[PDB]
Write a protein that binds this ligand. Sequence first.
Ligand SMILES: [Mg+2]
Ligand SMILES: [Mg+2]
Lengths: 312, 312, 589, 589
Amino acid sequence: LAKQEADLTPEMIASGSWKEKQFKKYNFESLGVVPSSGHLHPLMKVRSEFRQIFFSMGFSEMATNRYVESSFWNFDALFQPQQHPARDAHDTFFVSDPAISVKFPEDYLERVKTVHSKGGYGSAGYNYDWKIEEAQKNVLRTHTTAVSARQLYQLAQEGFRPSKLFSIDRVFRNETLDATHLAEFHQVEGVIAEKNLSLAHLIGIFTEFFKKLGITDLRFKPTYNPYTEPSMEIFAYHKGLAKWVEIGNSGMFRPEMLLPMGLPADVNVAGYGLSLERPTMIKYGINNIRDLFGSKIDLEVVYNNPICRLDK
Amino acid sequence: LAKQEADLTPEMIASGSWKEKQFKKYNFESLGVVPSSGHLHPLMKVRSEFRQIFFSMGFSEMATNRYVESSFWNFDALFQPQQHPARDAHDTFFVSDPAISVKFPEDYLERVKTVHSKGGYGSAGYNYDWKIEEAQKNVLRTHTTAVSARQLYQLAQEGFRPSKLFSIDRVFRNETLDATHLAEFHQVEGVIAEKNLSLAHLIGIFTEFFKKLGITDLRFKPTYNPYTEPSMEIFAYHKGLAKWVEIGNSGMFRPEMLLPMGLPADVNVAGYGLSLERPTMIKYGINNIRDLFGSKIDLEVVYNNPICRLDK
Amino acid sequence: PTVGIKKVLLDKHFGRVYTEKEFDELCFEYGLELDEITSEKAAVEKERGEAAAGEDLNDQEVYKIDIPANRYDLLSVEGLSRAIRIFKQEIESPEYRFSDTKTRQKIIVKRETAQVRPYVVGAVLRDVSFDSDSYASFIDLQDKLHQNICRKRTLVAIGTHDLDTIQGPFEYRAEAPNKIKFRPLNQTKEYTAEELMTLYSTDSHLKAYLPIIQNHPVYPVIYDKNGVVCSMPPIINGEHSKITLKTKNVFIEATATDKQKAYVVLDTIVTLFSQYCQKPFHVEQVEVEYEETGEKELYPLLSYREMTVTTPEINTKIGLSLKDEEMAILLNKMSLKAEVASKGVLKVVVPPTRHDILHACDIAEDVGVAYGYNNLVTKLPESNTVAVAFPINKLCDNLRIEIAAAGWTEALNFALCSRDDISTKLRLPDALSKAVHIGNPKTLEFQVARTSLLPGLLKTLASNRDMPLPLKLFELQDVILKDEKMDVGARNERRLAAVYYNKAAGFEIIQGFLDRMMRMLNVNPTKDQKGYHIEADENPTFFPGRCARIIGPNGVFLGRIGALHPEVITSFGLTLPCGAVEFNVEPFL
Amino acid sequence: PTVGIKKVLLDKHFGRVYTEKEFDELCFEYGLELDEITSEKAAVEKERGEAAAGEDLNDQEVYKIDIPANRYDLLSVEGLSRAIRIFKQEIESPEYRFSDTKTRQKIIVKRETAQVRPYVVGAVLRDVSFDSDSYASFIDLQDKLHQNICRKRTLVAIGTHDLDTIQGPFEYRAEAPNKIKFRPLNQTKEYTAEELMTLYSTDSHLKAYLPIIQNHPVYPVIYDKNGVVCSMPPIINGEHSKITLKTKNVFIEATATDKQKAYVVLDTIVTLFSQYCQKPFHVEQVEVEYEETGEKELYPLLSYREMTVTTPEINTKIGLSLKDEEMAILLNKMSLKAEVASKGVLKVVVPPTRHDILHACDIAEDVGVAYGYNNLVTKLPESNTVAVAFPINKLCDNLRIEIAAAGWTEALNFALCSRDDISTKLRLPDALSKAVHIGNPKTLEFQVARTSLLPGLLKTLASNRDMPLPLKLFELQDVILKDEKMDVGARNERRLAAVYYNKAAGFEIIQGFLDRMMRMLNVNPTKDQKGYHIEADENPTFFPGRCARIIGPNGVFLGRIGALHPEVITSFGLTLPCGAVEFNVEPFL
Ligand SMILES: [Mg+2]
Ligand SMILES: [Mg+2]
């Protein structure tokens, strides 16, 4: 062919010789050179979006860099009896070194022991012998409600004021090698504490929260949770399978884990929560979670990842 | 020297020959290779930070892609008389093509004309002959209060509810070639509308807003503004010059530009505002604004720009 | 807990045949969940894998139903059907009473038993009428209780015997291992404790229960009057006291170290299966006395617990406006007998079948389930608490983060410019017909408002010409266009523009940027009206043969891309080839 | 408006000598602003530039004071000093009245004047006592009024004449240009209208005022009884009626097309300079009649305006709790005479010097200025309306955006790992002394919690080994460490780690990443205890001679950086050189 370069040389621009020579036809059906870019993680993008939503609704972030936790805050402070299937060693990691924690607020621990072993505050308890040596043990936290209990106790000690808090962090559960679930997963939780709070207010709050996620119609089913009463489970219609699918849960904490802290009798604390991997898998169309989390992650999924338009 | 390469070859790692040959001493006083990165603009970073602060305080963003505006909304709707130095052609750009806008809400325009030419709603007016041909002309907006007036009228038409709004966009002023100021600048404004609002509430609101900016102690000075009464100007102590420096302004809109819209007599609308270039210049240590805005921008400033830790 | 129940058994107990959808809706209303449906033939066929096919069992369907962990009376069809039928207001809630008997059974506890298993309770069911299905249900209930609440038989153990095959006041001893010898269940010859442990060491089902009392110096044991080993808890029962379908009287006993769970388990068992008695819902008591202390107790308890709640608190916690009588009637559907004492105060009586009611909040959840969670009127938060962003700004911010990640630097320019920049330098003589003109400028630079973002980027390149190559600047901002249909005659359009300045500015370099920007917006390169594409075009401001027009979804024109004309380059002072792209981003909103 | 006033004149009028700081504080209290201080000698010296030095004027200092645009009585020292002294409660507020006179001046308006300048007002000041300074102030006030409110004399024009040099009832005619001829001010020979326009065409000061009435067929003119041209507004006055220091009576007139601004200007002028009269604060009226209509008016007005406000509205708008009497006394300091009628209702009388009080809100601003804006008790918003982020998360997010911009891909790994990964593969035999051990793992992979982020990145590299090079992964997450001083014995530390995997992994490539990360955190590479640096170190997990320790501000150890040992590479399955860096990011918080 002729001098038909894909571009004009600077000499041609300077001398004005571009009007005497032909140029090569360009194939407009092809694709260009892919730029070398830096990428984020889809789970981190979803976490940032959730944080922005919580900030826009008026929630203050909590400190959740407390993976190792004593059994007192994780179980006993939440009114889970020591001899029930909830506190089983089959699904909870136990720490051997260090094994025990010794320093606790004595008065609060005494009140917790009294409510567990004899009852009170209009309750009946379990009339079993509460043992301190059981609460001494250290475990990896199975849920973020321990941090919420710590924050509520701290708020009650220094005077009460209405509050809205949220947390998004890892939790650990003891599971065998399978594909249904992993040993660690990120849990999103939001807590609202104020006077004369009702279940309808909570319904409206998470209805608004899910409306910002692109979900409009919701249904509710009764369920059971050890530390919340009443409790419910949220379902949304899915057109890909044409059926109702569970999406999250909520509930109001029991008075037996609030009055010993010191909160006023007129204050109701409610909360709701969900996971983080399920919405990400639904949005981005991901089948196997191990392709996204862990050492077996597929980087091609990370590279070709669009922005998080979760409202779409 | 010896085979003292700066690195081990993959052959050396595979064959384990790294323990028979010396390596070259590395100068730890030097610097490494600068990565090729993409950069943002400091003004855009500051704008994003301001947007996040406004969202965290509960303000809803407004639509400000309306550079060209009729003189009715820009001046007449804000109760600025047509024969006063405020509406001078010396500092306002005027549009020649297109020149006029014809479609206005007739009833609202009639009420505005009545209040301008005769007075009412407990006011005295200016008893001058209001001319529609003056309001027909199109200008480039000199402030973002026109968008606020549009939003307030729309809110009043469809029923009132407490609201918090904000806007950050360009405004235009007619200036000669100098160094003190430019013809365009970004103006940050926030508006709060609710029942029985007081000046103390506004003081608290912008006190919190500036506390998130790293400014603690403030002082107030009386000032004059055509469409707000009472009005004030905010000063903060500066240690670099050891003197008090003006940082922003605030005020509550006049009843003569609210009652014709249709707002209830019990609703008070307040607002505050500031610029965007001054905090950026103070934070990043920039002397000449033209090195940051316009076609004469210095890219070395953009490249070596740290993140916006405005709370620091 | 998961309970498998035959479909025909469900039809018999409920009284009507339910389809799958009706039963699923009924489960959704109450809180249960229909996990799976599988015929018992197919259940055996695919229980250990479809290869191990077993069709020797019933071909009737079996439903797997999930039960709440704190509900104990829903572990068998007898309690589940009763609860559901009371919920739908089919039958009246039963009442449990004590049957008068002049001769009560007696258990005497020895002192040494305080070392291992210090607590024991018991009850008697009289005139039973077991059949093929009720016996299997009776065994399954014990299995579930031993697997869930008894904590793998570590805390509580249950034993059942025939009351007629044995006789006399029973004794609970803790003799030495070598002092006990009897014939085990399903065994021929007799064994001692050590022989029994050796025999069951290699077993599978009973292997795990051995270490419970393996290391203790003494073993628990139960004897009748005539020195017959009734059972050796918690390991196995006695063959002489085996219970079969011909039995008419059952003696139930529970040995435990935790006293409360024994009460719960005994009450659950004695209430679930008291209907099969010849006199329905009637049990006789058993007396237990401890020799060490000399105290006497009677079992079972059948505890009805009285609570006092307040209506305003329930309404505030739930978010309703129910009256006293409405709340009482609503609670009557949940097996709770509620009675109004005065205004705002309600007296509730919890039956023995409900051992999960500790606080008033449990009653509140009951009154919320009876009313229905989908009939609550929500109350949304106030508008001035939720902040809504402007959608185009949010999209632009998210896109700009990715643009920076790609390696492009952001710039900023003025909105006002001169006529020569947007008309003559761009080789567009007619461009002035669409721009907005300014009447009174103070300089020969603010004549018109910009219609394209290219001149700003080109001038910024001209200013910073001495910086090292390549220079990759971008800008996404508004442009002003004339539109007659608008209120004022002009409108703002958000556009994204980018340039690539270097000694070589091939079409591929900027085409890749376009492709990446499209990928980040989740639009695939397809020609089927759902994706974007490009096609050849002619435009004065772009070099011939290197200009293309961008068509987005639904055949919408978006912008342009290509190499700039040499005259456009020289009109801004530049001297090197530059590639450019500019397109609208409002359609993607 | 900016007003320049001599310092000695300020001292004379105020009554006491103020220092610069006292005057600046006084301005800050009331709302003014002291722009600049310059002696009139220096003012002339540097007015046109320091090169054009003029020292022929007074060496006394002159203050430049900024005046609010809606305040008209503060345009001269006479009004400014009066307002400030009333504000500080030094003197009583003056009262303006009318002086009785049996012979009033008269102005007769002709019909043709309705074509150009249809409105005229007037007043007379009697028994004036002007001196050197008051005359200059009188001229300066007229200059300011003509420059600001009169809109460059387009709307209103002011003229002053000596009442004794002229006599007779005045007439306001609109004769033709060729019908008027007189001697202009500061001129020798007489001129006509056309000659006057030709003469002033090339002038500078009067050039701009000509096009006001240049094209009209007729020109305004004022005549006395004896056919003497008093003035030709709005161009110039008559030489015969010039006013000098010897004048004892002044006639002030205003010609306008806008009727309200004429009232405002006349009231301002007649109130500011009524103190210099032999009878202070007393003016006599002038009658103006229109021939076309036959109506008669008297001027000036001296309008006292009565308003009725409500105390609760003022308190709600301002945010106070003042009583009625306190608010009245507070308003009395702002030249307003306030009187209480009943409870919650206040009657206010605005004097003619205040022509900026239109609505009650103006009174509210007055009551807020008198009280003081720094004495208001603020009321902060509720805590559950403001959202506060966790600082480390915010810093990490902002830093991660820049890390992505640099070209590094993010990864994610598990928190739990095995002993071999963190102890043996990293060539750290003692590393187990600091880790946290797990008691009951279900697999040989969850023995301990991770103490370093390197194994996760290395395993992720191993999985994706087949992807094209180079691979640049990063991760900033928490690690668990054992600490005895903690509540539970362990703590979480946020660390940032990054790797660079390629056939060549020079120290420079990762050192540049470290430098960029430090730059984005605003820390310079200095050795003066305020910046970061690196120095040689020995560590088993890094290759000898390529390991360094990072020292941050205040000599705080941060982490490590360098090339990994070949054994560490081979222990994870990798086969190519890799560079790594890991450091804490909590000190930068
Ligand atoms: Mg319940
Ligand atoms: Mg005022």
